[model samples]
Target: STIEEQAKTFLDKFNHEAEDLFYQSSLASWNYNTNITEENVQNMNNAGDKWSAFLKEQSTLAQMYPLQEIQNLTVKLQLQALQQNGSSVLSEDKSKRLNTILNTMSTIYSTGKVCNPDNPQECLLLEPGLNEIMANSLDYNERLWAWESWRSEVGKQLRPLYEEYVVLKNEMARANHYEDYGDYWRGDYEVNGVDGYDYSRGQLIEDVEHTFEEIKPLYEHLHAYVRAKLMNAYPSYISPIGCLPAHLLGDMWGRFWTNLYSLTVPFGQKPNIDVTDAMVDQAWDAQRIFKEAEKFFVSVGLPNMTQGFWENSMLTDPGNVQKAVCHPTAWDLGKGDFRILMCTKVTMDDFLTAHHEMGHIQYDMAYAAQPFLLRNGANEGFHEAVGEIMSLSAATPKHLKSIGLLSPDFQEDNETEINFLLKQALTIVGTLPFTYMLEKWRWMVFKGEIPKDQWMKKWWEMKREIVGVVEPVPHDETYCDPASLFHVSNDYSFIRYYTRTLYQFQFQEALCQAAKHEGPLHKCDISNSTEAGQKLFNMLRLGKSEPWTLALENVVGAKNMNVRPLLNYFEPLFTWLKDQNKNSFVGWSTDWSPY
Candidate 1:
C-alpha cells in the first residue's frame, strides 16, 4: 500500500501545480525577433549595455559547461541515486539498478550561460565587444602563457623563420596598397567581362604583408603593455552545453612545439608557395573530386531530399553582389511561412559554404512538421550548423545538376563528379585551419593580453603559414596573398562557421555516401507534416532544449564527426591540385576580393 501510495504520488505530478509550471513555461518572457535586420542589430547593442550592468551584480559569476543549475541537479540526483544502489546503479543488469536515462533529459542545461544577452556591455565582437568575451572567457591566462613562451622561443630558436613569415605577409599588404592591408579591399573587381583586373592575388597578398610590416615596429613598442596584458588574470572559456573539456579551451603549445616535425604537417615546413585563384577556387567547389557526397545521400534512400540551401548559382543573381550572402531565410509569413535573404559581403569561392548555411535554414523548415522545440538538434552546433556540411556534399556534379547549379555540360557531357568534388574539398581544407588560426589569433590578442599591433602581427605570421600551404605554382600567392581578405566578424563565434564546416562535411559525407546506392541525390520528404523520425526531428529544429550529445547521437549515428573523417576528405583533396593543372581545370577557378 505504501509502494502504491509512492507510485500514486509520483504520477500525480500531472496535477494543478504541475500544470501551473507548464503554463508558465509555455509563456515566453524574452524578446523574440527572428531576423537580424539593422534595427535588431542595433538593439543588440543596447541590450549589451543592459547586460553589462546586470553582470556588475556581485552575485553574477560564470562557471563551465554543464551549466550551474543542471550541474547542481545532476550531482544531487546522481549522489542520491548512488546512495540508494551503490556502484550497481551504473549497470542495468543489477537488481534495482538506477537508470541513467533521466540524466540525459535535462542535458541541455549543462553547458555554460548564454552569452546570448550574455556579454551585456560589448554588443558585436567588432572591437569592445570582442574584448569583453575574450577577457571574460576565463581561459585567457593559459593562452597568454602559451603565446609568450612560444613566441619567445620563436624569436630565439627560429628568428629567421619568424622574419621570413613577416617579410612574406608584409609584402602581400604593400602590394595590395592598403595602410592596414590585412583584409583591406583594393576597390577592385575581378568580375567576368567587367574589365576588373583591379584585384590581383599576387599584388594583394604583398600589400597585406606590407600592412603587417608596419605592425612590426608597433608590436615592439607595445612590449611592456603586451606583458601586462599577459599578466592580467584570465578566465576560462564558456563552452556551450555538451561540448567536451577539450573543445572549449586553450591552444596546446606542446602540440605546436613538436620536435619531430614533418614537412607536410609542420608550420615551418609548409610546402605550397602560391595559393592563387585556381587553388582557392578548388576548395570552394568540392564538386569536382568529392562527387559522391550527394550520391551517397541518394544511395541511402532519401532520394532528392535537399538538406541545406544555396538556391544554386546565386552568384549570378540579379542583386547578388560579392557580399556575405545569407540564403533565402524563411519566416512565419502568415500565409504558411516563407523566407527572405540576407546579403553579407563574402567570397565567391565559398559558394558551397553558402549552400551549407542555407541548409541550416532548411533544417528549420524541414523539421517544422514537429513540435517547435523538437524542431532542433541536441546541442547548439548539432543540427542547424551541421546541415551546412551537406552543402559541401552537394557540391558534386549530380547534386549540383539535380539542384540546377551546374551548367548543361555537367549534366549532359562530362558527368563524373568526383574530380570536381575533390577540387572543392581541397579549398575547404586550406580555408579551415587558415581561418581558424586567424580567429584564434584574435582571441589570443584579446585574451592573451597581447598588444593590438602584436595581435595583428601574430596573425600575419599565422596567415603566411597557410598562404604558402599549397605546392608552389610558377609564382605563388601565399595565404598572405593580398587578395585574401577576411576579418574577425564575430568575437568567439566565427570559429563556429569554420569548425562547423568540418563537422558539417563529416555529416554530409557519411549521410551521402551511405545513401549513394539509392541514386544521385536524396530528397527528404520533410514537407510531409506527419512524419515522426527523431533523427529528422532533432537534426532540424530543436535548439538547446536537451542534451547536446543526445541530440547529435540521434542523427549522425554518433555524438560527433571526428578528426579521422576530416583527414580522409583532406587526403584526396590534397591531390586534386596536381591533377587540376594536368587536366587544365584552371578555367573553373575565379579570383575573389571582398569589397
Candidate 2:
C-alpha cells in the first residue's frame, strides 16, 4: 500500500481500539477521583496499564512510516500523536512503580490535614479550612502554623516518593528519546518545522524568559506596594525591603493574592467586586453557579453542556460518604462525555472557576468531531489559555452586574477602575513568577542541575530570587515543601499556567476587538458577541490538527505568543502601582533569607 494508504489503514483500526481504551481509562480515573476506594484505585491502575501498553505499541508502529512520504495532514498528526508518549513510555515495571508512587503522593496530598497543636480534635483540611485561614486570618502565628504544618504533614511524607517519581519520569522521557522529563513536557510547544515555524524547547525557555523580563518592572512595583500595605497590617513581622512572607500572600501556595484585596485595595470605600456574600444572599448554589457559567457560553453561540455533563458531573461535595479528590478538573471521557469534578462553593472564586472549568468542556465539545488523536488544544497552554479567556470576561464588573451578582447601580469611575484592575493583577500578575519558578525548578531537577540534597536549598533560592516570597521557617532535605502544592505531587507540568496567562490576554484582546469593544481592555465583556464566539470556535475546532501558532494566528493575528496584550490590559494598574510605590522600597534584598 502507499504510505498515505498505509497510515490511514493503521489509524482507522487504531482509532476504534484507542477510543475504547481511552474511554475505559478515563472512566476508571473519574470513578476513582469521585469515589476514593481501594477497588477503584486498583481498577484505575489496571485500565491505565492497558492504555499505556497500547500507546507504546502504536508509537512503535508509527515510527515505521516515513513522515516525509505522508502528504495528508490528518495522517501526519495521528503519527505525531502516537510518537508523543508520556510516562507510559517507561518499562512495564517502572511504569507500574511510577503509577503507584503518583497515586500514593496524590492521596497523601488529598487527605492531608493539620490540627491545632492545642486542640488536636479541631483539624483543618487544605481546601476550605487552611485556605480560609490563609485568606482571612490576620494572625501571623496562625498563618505560619498552617503553612508549616502542611509542608511537614504532606510534603515531608511525599519527599521519598517524589524522589522516586523524578527518577522514573526521567527514565520514561529518555526512553522516548528526550533529554529529560522537562524537555518532554516542553515538547507540547515544540513544532519542528511543522506549519512553517521551527519551534524548539530552547525557544520556549527563551520566550518564557523574555516575557518575564518584560513584566518584571510591573511585578516589582506591585510587590513593593503590597509589601508596604502588609507592613502596615503586620508591623512587627514585615520588613521594608525584604521578601514577603510566603504564608501571608493570601493563599496557601501564594499563587494568587486576590484575598489580600482587603489590605491592598486602592479604594476601600468603593463597593467590593467580590460577590461571595451577594451570591449567598441571592440563594446561589453550586448548580446555579455552573448553570450561569453555561449560560454565558451559550449566550455567545457556544455549545451547551450535554445531558451527560449535568447527570455525571460531581459538582458539589459528596459529604461524609467518600474521600474524593476535590481538585477541580474537567474530563473528556470520549464519546461526547464531558464532566467536571469539584467540591464547588458559592464564592466568587468558584464562580470564576466554574467558568474556567466549563471552558475546558466547551473546547472539548468543539473538537469532539475531530479524529481521536486530534482532540486536544493546539498545545497544553492553548487549552488553559482558552479557559482563562472566559474567566477574564466573566470577572469584569459589567458581567457581574448583568448577571445580578453585583449591584445594578454600580458605577464605574477612576477609583473603581483602579480597584478592579488591582484585584485582577493580584490574581493574574501575582501568579506568573510563581508558575515560572516552579517549572524552572522542576526542569532543573529533571536535568540534574540541582542535586537531591540541595533540592530544598535551591527551591528557596529561586522562590526568593524570582518570586520574592520567603519561607517563614527553616527547612532541610527531609522536608519537600514544593510537593505541598497539588500540581507538584500530581506530576503536572507548571509552565502551562504561565504560558496561558500570556495567551489568554492575547486572545481576549482579539475577541474584544471582534466584539467591537470601545473601552478599556479590562472592562470589555465579550459575552453575547457571536462575532467573538465564532472566532474563538474557529480555533477550537482545529484542535491539535495544526500547530499552536496557526490556531493562535486564526484569532490573535499573531504568529508568536505576545505579552503586549497582558501588559496593555494592566497598563493602568501598572501606572497606579508605580506611583504608590515611589516612596516605598520597590525591590527585595538578596541577603534576606530565613535560614
Candidate 3:
C-alpha cells in the first residue's frame, strides 16, 4: 500500500516530468524532420514556444489529477500519456479534464517530438517540440513515417545473410557455450579473442559467480526447474536464468532484439579470419531471421490470429510499417496474445512492430491457460525469445530449401534477403562495441579517465573499431547514454533489445538445419515464394511453452546462442546493402533518404 502511495506520488511527479519530455521530444523531432533552413528556424522557435505553452497547460492538469481519485486504476493510463511511452492507454469511457488537455498536447506532440539543443550540454534542445515538429517537418501530412515502416526497412536490409552467418559462427558459438556463460548476462559477444574464444562483453568476468545476486534467489525459487529445461533447449550459456555478471540478458534480449538488433559482427578495421567469419555469419543470419519471421504468425485458442498481424498489416502503411506499431500486441491481454514479434527486421529494429507483435498473439493463444495476471512473459526475454524462435526458423537454410531459395550445396549466388539482414545485424553489432567504448570513454571523461578535448577523436576511434564507418559528426556528447534514443523514445524497456540481437544468430542457426532436410544452401527461391507464411505459422504453434532456448532447439534444432551465425548472416548482404546506401540511422536529420 505504501508502495502504491509512493508510486502514486512518483507517478504524479513522473507524469509532469514525462509531459515535459513529450513536449521536448515533440519539438526536437519536428526540427529534425523539417528542412530547417535559416528562414524556418525562426518559425520553428516560435512554434516551439507555443507548443511549450500548450504542454505547460497539459502538465498543469496532470499535476491536478490525484492518485486517490483515479476511477478504476488509471494511474498507469495517465502515466502513459505523461511519459509518452508510446503505448496507448485503455479507451476512456469518460475523458477526464486532463484528457482534455492531453488531446491538445498529443496534437502538439505529434507535430514535433524531438528536443535537440544548441549547446553540446543541451544537444536535445537542438530540436523542436510537438506543434513545432508538425508546423515544421512532416510532409504537409505530419506523419512520422510510422515506426513499423522504419523497422521493416531494417530487416529487409539484413535478412539475406542468415545461411552464411550460420556456417561461419559454428566454432565461435561452441566456445561461448564452453565459457559457462548464461543467457542472463548482457553485452555478450563472440568475436576473436586472445585464446581460442573471442572477446567477451568483458565488463565483469573475474567474479561472474556473483551475478544476479539480488534476484538469483528469486529466480531459483521461481524457475530452477523451468530454467533447467531451457538450459537443455539452449546450452551455450550456463543457464538461461539471471547470472548478474553483466546487463540483464533476458531484458536486454527483449529490449534490443524486440525492436533493435545487437548481433552485427564488428568490421574491426579490417576483415581477418575471425572478422570475415563473423561478417559471413552476420549476413546469413539476417536473411534467416526474415525468412523465419515470414513463417511467424498468431492464431488464438489454441492461439489465434483472427485479429492479428495480417489484420494489423492491413491497417499499416507499407511505407510506414515500423512507426505503425503503437503497442506491441501482447499475448495475454484480457484480450489475447497480440504482442509477440514474428519478424526480425521490423520487430528487432523498433522492439515493438507488427511483424513480431503478432508472435505475441500466437504465444498468448498457446499459453492462455495460465492465470490472467500470470499470462505475460514469464520473464521479459521469455516471450520475446518465443517470438525469436519463429524468426530464426525463418532464417534457416532448411526452411529456404523447402521453398527452393537455396541448395544443400552452398552457392555465392544465394545472396538475397538473408544477406540484406546480415548487414543490418552488423550495423547493430558494430555499433555496440563502439557505443560501449564510447560509454566507457564518456565515463572516463566524466571521471577524468580521458580528456574531454579528445571526445571527437574517441568517438571516431570506437566507430572505426566496431564497424569501420568513416563518417564524421560535429561532436561526441550525449551519444553513449544507453537510455537515450531507444529507451526514451519508447518506454518499452531496453535490455531485451540487446539480448534479441544475439538470440537472432542462434535462431538462424537452428532454423537453417530444420529447413536443411529438404535440400541445399540457396535451395529455396524466395524471389516470390508463397510458403513463407506457412513456415512462420508452423513456428508459431510451438509458442512460448518452450523456453526461448528450448523453443530454438525444438522448433528449429540447434541450441546454443552465439553472434557468429548472425555475423555471418550479414557480411555479404551488408557489403551489398552498403553499396545500395539503404542505411537509415535516426539522428539530427529525419528525411526519408539513404534507407
Candidate 4:
C-alpha cells in the first residue's frame, strides 16, 4: 500500500479509539473535579492511565511512518498529536508516578485550609475565607497572616512533590527529544518546520521578552501610582520608593489588582463602574449571570449554549458536594459536550468570568467539526485570548448600560474615562509582568539554571526585579511559595496568560474595526455585530489545522503577536499614570531581596 493509504488506515482507527478514550478520561476528570471523593479520584486516575498508555502506544506506531512523506494535513496533524504526549513518553511506572504526584498536589491545593492563629478552632478554606480577607481587609496584620498561612499550609506541603515533578517532567521532555520541560511547554507554539512556518523555542522567549519590555513602562507607572496609594492606606507598612508588599496587592497571588481599585481610583468623585451591588439588587443570580453572558455571545452571532450545557454545568457550587475544586474551568467532554465548573458569585469579577468561561465553550463548539487532533486553539494562548476578547466587550460601559447594570444616563468624561481605564489596567496591565516572571522562573528551574536550594531566593529576586512586587516576609527553600499559585500547583503552562494578554487586545482591535467602532479602542463593543462575529468565526473554525500565525493573521491582519493594540487600548490610562507618578519613583531596586 502507498504511504498515504497506510497512514489513512491507521489514523482512521486511531482517531475513533482516541476520541472515545478522550471522552472517557474527560468525563472521569470532570466527575472528580465536581465532586471530590476517593472513589472519583481513583476512577479519574484509572481513566487517565489508560488514555496515557494508549497515546504512548499510538505514538510508537506513528514513528514507523516517515513524517516528512505525509502530505495529508489531517493525517499529519493526527500523527503529530500522538507524538506530542508529554509524560506519556516515560515508562508506565514513571508515567503513573507523575500522574499520581500531579493529582495529589492538585487535591492538596483544592482542599487547602488555614487555621487562624488567634482562634485555633476556626479554620478557613482558601476560597471564600482567606480570599475575602486578602481582597478586602485593611488590617495589615490580618492580610499578612492569611498570606503567610496559605504558603505555609498549602505551598509548604507541595515542595517535595513539585521537586519530583520537575525531575520527571524533564525526563519526559528528554525522551520526546526536547531540551527540558520548559522547552516542551514552549513547543506548543513552535511550528518546528511545520507548514512552512519556522517558529522556535528561542524565538518564543525573545518575543515574550520584547513584549514585556514594550509594556514594562506602563506597568511601572501603574505600580508606582499603586504603591503611593497603598502607602496612604497603610502608612507604616508601605514604602514610598520600594516594592509593594505581595500580600497587599488585593489578591492572594497579586496576579490581578482589580480589588485595589477602591484604594487607587483615579477620581473618587466620579461614579463607580462596578455593578456588583446593582447586579444583586436586580436579582442577578449565577444562572442569570451566565444567561446574560450567553445573550452577549448570541448577539454577536455565536451559537447558543447547548441544552446539555445548561443542564450539566455547575454554574454555582454544588451544596451537596463536600470537597469540590472551585477553580473556574471550562470542560470539553467530547461529542458536543461542553460545561463550566465554577462556584459562581454575584460579583463583577465573577460576572466577567462567566463571559470568559463561556468563551471557552464557544471555542470548543467552533472547532467541533474538526478531527480530534485539530480540535484545539491554534495555540493555547489563542484559546485563552479568544475568551478574553468576549470579556473586553462585556466589560465596556456601553454594554453594561445596555444590560441595565449601569445607569442609562451615565456619561463618559475624561475623569470617568481615567477611572474606568485605571480599573482595567489594574487587572490587565498589572498581570503582564506577573505572568511573564512566573513562567520565566519555571523555565529557568526546568533548565536547571536555578538550584533547588536557591529556588525561593531567585523567585523573590525576579518578583522584585521583573514584577516589582516583594514578599512581605522572608521565605526559605522549605516554603515553595510559587506552588501557592493555582497554575503552578495544577501542572499547567503559565506563559499562555501572558501571551493571551497581548492577543486579546489585538483581536479586540480587529473585531472593533470590523464592527465599525469609532473613538478610543477601549470603548468599542462588538455586541450584535455580525460582521465582527463572522470574522472571529472564520478564525475559530480553523482550530489548530493551520499554524497560529495564519489563524491570527486571518482575524487580526497580523501574523505575529503584537502589543501595540494593547498599549493603544490603555494609552489614556498609561498617560494618566505617568502624570500621576512623575514625582514618585517609577521603578524598583533589584538589590533589595526578600530572603
Could you tally the backbone clashes for each prediction? 98, 0, 175, 0
Once model 3 is optimally superposed onto the true structure by TM-score, how far is the C-alpha of residue 182 displaced, in angstroms?
18
Ranking by lDDT: 2, 4, 3, 1
Evaluate model 2: give its TM-score: 0.86
- lDDT tens string, model 3, 1-595? 5444654676556544544444454444343332335655665566677666655565555554445544333343433234331111223432243244334333432333232333345322112333233223323212232222222332233223322222222223234343211221333222221233233444323222232232122222212222233344335433232321111122211122212112222232332111224334445443343334344332211323444434432232225323322233343323331323222332234322433544555555655553222234423555576565443444444444454434457433333444434434434443343334434443333334445456445645544433222321122432322222332222233345434555545544544444432443223222232244344345445432223344444444544444555545444543543443333221111111111
Candidates 1 and 4, the one with greater TM-score: 4
lDDT string, candidate 4, 1-595, tens digits: 7898898888888878888899999999998998888999999999999998888788877878777887767677778776665555668999788889988888988998778868889887888878888888888877887888788777778898988888887888888788998988898887745555668777999888887788887877887888787788889766666777777788888888888888888788778677888988888788788889899989989999899988988877768736688999988999778998999888998988988899988998999998878888898888788887888788888899898888898887899888878877888888888888898999999999998889889998888788887787777778888888898888788888888888888998888998998899988998888988998999989998888878888888977889999889989887777777778887877655433
Provide the overall lDDT of each model, using Cα atoms, as 2-decimal numbers: 0.34, 0.84, 0.36, 0.84
Which residue window of length 10 is worst by lDDT in model 4? 586-595
- Stretches of candidate 1 above 4 Å error? 1-328, 332-338, 341-358, 365-395, 399-419, 449-454, 466-492, 516-534, 570-572, 575-595
Q: Which residue pairs overlap in candidate 4's backbone?
A: none
Collision count of model 3:
175
Estimate TM-scores for all models: 0.37, 0.86, 0.36, 0.87
Model 1 lDDT per residue over 1-595, tens place: 4333333243234232333332222221111133335655566556555543432331121111122233333232222222222222222442221122212212311221222234466333212432233323445444343333323332233222332333333344445443422332222211111132223424533433443343233222221221222223322321111111111122222112111111112123223212234335444343422233333343433333232222322222234333233444433221123233434233433444445544454455555553222334433355545555555444444454454334446332222234333234334443454455554454344333445335434544454343321111111111222111222211123444453554565565445444433333222212112222334444455443334444455556664335444545444333433343343212111122111
How many angstroms is residue 584 displaced in model 3 relative to the true structure, after the best TM-score fit? 25
Quick one: best TM-score, which candidate?
A: 4
Q: What C-alpha lDDT, on a 0 to 100 scale, does residue 301 get in candidate 1?
A: 31
